[PDB]
């Protein structure tokens with residue numbers, strides 16, 4: 001991994017904070033904007049392994065839809081991981097703050113980028129385990145990149161991941177991963193279907209206020225999230241197939257990328273909408 005000297009790094013603004021380090025926006029020696037994650041002195045061996053392990057995993061990847069690693073500071077303290085800076089932050093928050101501001105075509109293009117990143121990861125034999133809009137970042141070209149890499153650190157550090165009766169983010173997780181700890185690229189496909197629903201709804205919370213146990217029971221009884229408003233039928237047809245109980249029946253990421261690319265290349269295909277089930281009746285004479 002590229003080792004960066006600390007005199008090349010200027011931390012400008014804290015953008016994320018944790019107990020054991022913070023995430024900063026800063027500049028890297030003209031100088032270029034970067035994001036900087038630190039690990040404070042006193043860290044344990046496991047914290048060091050997890051922290052540098054994230055940088056080790058990201059250094060093995062070179063794709064447009066995967067956050068790019070610039071380098072690390074490991075010879076000085078605090079240790080740091082330096083990556084490209086994504087100017088619009090996390091996708092879930094971004095969509096909630098930009099409700100209704102994009103075209104259907106722009107939304108579908110976000111999903112194609114996420115899918116192409118996930119296709120790369122799956123083909124690299126990397127199972128993400130925590131695919132969700134909160135773990136995708138967005139830049140000033142609207143490009144979405146998969147973020148949040150590691151081993152045990154990924155689900156450990158995610159506040160949405162809860163201890164079940166394994167520590168997992170239930171509303172995003174496929175049934176076999178909940179039931180018996182089977183995390184594969186096909187469980188990431190289920191997650192991706194939830195991310196398709198998050199994007200098309202501008203960041204609605206999956207299953208709204210149902211509790212985690214209620215979500216598991218609904219999924220096991222066969223219920224699935226309803227169509228978003230203004231959602232192309234083909235998009236809904238795709239997210240439903242990501243949510244097949246039988247893992248072998250789900251599309252692979254290659255199928256998902258192929259379908260999305262064909263829809264974008266014939267954008268009239270996105271004008272056919274799935275019916276939306278209204279929850280409110282308004283009657284006027």
Ligand SMILES: Cc1cccc(Cl)c1NC(=O)c1cnc(Nc2cc(N3CCOCC3)cc(N3CCOCC3)c2)s1
Pocket residue numbers: 015016023035036037054067081082083084085086087088089090137147148149
């Ligand atoms: C530095 C680093 C080390 C290991 C792994 C990674 Cl993926 C990274 N890189 C990064 O975390 C980031 C790269 N670009 C970033 N942009 C960014 C930019 C922003 N902002 C964008 C401008 O408006 C203020 C917030 C927020 C965030 N957040 C803050 C809350 O936690 C979720 C992300 C993130 S963070």
